[PDB]
Amino acid sequence: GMQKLTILGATGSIGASTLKVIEQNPDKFSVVALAADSNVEKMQQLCQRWQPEYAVMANKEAALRLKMALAVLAPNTQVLGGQEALCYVATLEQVDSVMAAIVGAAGLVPTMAAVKAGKRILLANKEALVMSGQLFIDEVEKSGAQLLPVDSEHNAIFQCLPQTVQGNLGRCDLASQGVSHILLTGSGGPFRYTDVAELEAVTPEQAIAHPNWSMGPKISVDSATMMNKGLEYIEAKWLFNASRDQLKVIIHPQSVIHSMVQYLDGSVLAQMGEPDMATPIALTLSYPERVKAGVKPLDFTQVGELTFLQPDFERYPCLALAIEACYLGQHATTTLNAANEVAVAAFLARQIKFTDIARVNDSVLNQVCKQLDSLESLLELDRMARTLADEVVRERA
């Protein structure tokens, strides 16, 4: 039986990795729809190669351009435009799975639409669980959607957990399945071996120099502060329904091990592999089976040494903020994430120091939280939080 897919966010690197897996398994997967933002040139090339039934641009003007370009290159592809069209392709009857890889706030509504339709969700959008975890888990339970996490760490944890837990995300009783705790791993960022005193002076040039990867500058800074891990922590809490006793963070500088699980008998399972997103994506497509992903086997002769260390809160005050916000709930995580988007832009623009990012997040978080949720209500909250963060940034210069 062929798996039919909608890919939301087809022109970015997650979309490319998904398409590489599908290309390696032409008998097993079939693309019905491709959707993107306003990169028409990339989209026309993908529609030419894939000849999908539907192609959607989130931007209506971009959709008009694509429709002109496709009318002969991809003549059986119907081009659509706008937010309602993203929901439409995410909810088609013939579709089994939706790669939810549109990033930011814009991804929430279509990701939610696929959830309400009971699809298999290949979740590659952080905001769904960072802003609105409770709401998504509640809707997933209502519709019978399956949630399969795409992010490297979550996907690793998922593989290290037993099958009964894998098939019950959002709701799982970890203790009763013999899990003592999940070990969420991270690189520690470029300042992992730098003195706390030196952090005041660090520049964006220094903070973006990620030790293992070359990502967007926003996410690279989140890795320098470990806000990135804090957001992964929040997501993991909702995916695996972890109490405050059941989720830990460890620094693993080399990022070969992607995360681990500690079982009750003393046994630890760990997931490792080459740093290629096709591996985890492949699992989310194929679960409970496995398929070729175009990724080579890990070469242990070249892996080097693996080490571990303990983060501290002097160095990574953002990680404390995120864990705290995590157990305060959606209002708090929404606020923190919004504050941090603004604080990080402010550091990239040289308006504030590196150590002010956490100060901004701390102020905004305190104000909002001192003084029924919906996607709309949480977006309003995001706006409010952004305004407060704008105000604190002004003061810090």
Residues that bind its own copies (CB under 8 A): 159-160, 162-163, 177-178, 180-181, 183, 250, 257, 260, 262-274, 276, 278-280, 282-283, 286, 288-293, 295-298, 300-301, 303-310
**Is 141 annotated as belonging to a binding site?**
no
264 or 349: whose CB is closer to its own copies?
264
Minimum CB–partner distance for residue 284 and its own copies (Å): 10
81 or 273: whose CB is closer to its own copies?
273
Bridge pairing between strands 179-186 and 120-123: unpaired
Q: Three-state SS for 88? A: helix
**Is 235 annotated as belonging to a binding site?**
no
Minimum CB–partner distance for residue 292 and its own copies (Å): 6
**Is 59 annotated as belonging to a binding site?**
no
Which residues have a Cβ under 8 Å from the Cβ of 128 and sit 6 or more positions away? Answer: 100, 107, 108, 111, 112, 136
- Residue pair 22/3 in contact (Cβ under 8 Å)? The answer is no
Minimum CB–partner distance for residue 176 and its own copies (Å): 9
Task: Report CA-CA distances (Å) from 28 to 22, 164, 314, 382.
Answer: 8, 25, 49, 40
Q: Is the peptide bond before 275 cis (omega within 30 degrees of 0)?
A: no
Long-range CB contacts (within 8 A, 24+) of 157-160: 157/182, 157/184, 157/236, 157/239, 157/240, 157/259, 157/260, 157/261, 157/271, 158/239, 158/283, 159/269, 159/271, 159/283, 160/259, 160/260, 160/261, 160/269, 160/270, 160/271
- E strands, 328-395, are none
Minimum CB–partner distance for residue 159 and its own copies (Å): 6
**Is 220 annotated as belonging to a binding site?**
no
DSSP code at position 200: G
**Is 111 annotated as belonging to a binding site?**
no
**Is 178 annotated as belonging to a binding site?**
no
111 or 187: whose CB is closer to its own copies?
187
25 or 59: whose CB is closer to its own copies?
25
9 or 273: whose CB is closer to its own copies?
273
**Is 223 annotated as belonging to a binding site?**
yes
**Is 12 annotated as belonging to a binding site?**
yes
Minimum CB–partner distance for residue 249 and its own copies (Å): 11
Give CA–CA dist 192/141, Å, rounded.
39
Minimum CB–partner distance for residue 54 and its own copies (Å): 28
At 151, the amino acid letter reads D
Which residues have a Cβ under 8 Å from the Cβ of 332 and sit 6 or more positions away? Answer: 324, 325, 326, 365, 368, 369
Minimum CB–partner distance for residue 215 and its own copies (Å): 20
73 or 309: whose CB is closer to its own copies?
309
93 or 289: whose CB is closer to its own copies?
289
Bridge pairing between strands 257-263 and 268-272: antiparallel
Instruction: Calculate helix-pair angle for 60-73, 40-50, nearest 10 degrees.
Output: 40
Binding region for NADPH: 11-14, 39, 125, 127, 216
Point out the annotated binding site for 1-deoxy-D-xylulose 5-phosphate: 126, 152-153, 187, 210, 223, 228-229, 232
Q: Which residue numbers belong to the known binding site for Mn(2+)?
A: 151, 153, 232
Q: Which residues are annotated as a binding site?
A: 11-14, 39, 125-127, 151-153, 187, 210, 216, 223, 228-229, 232
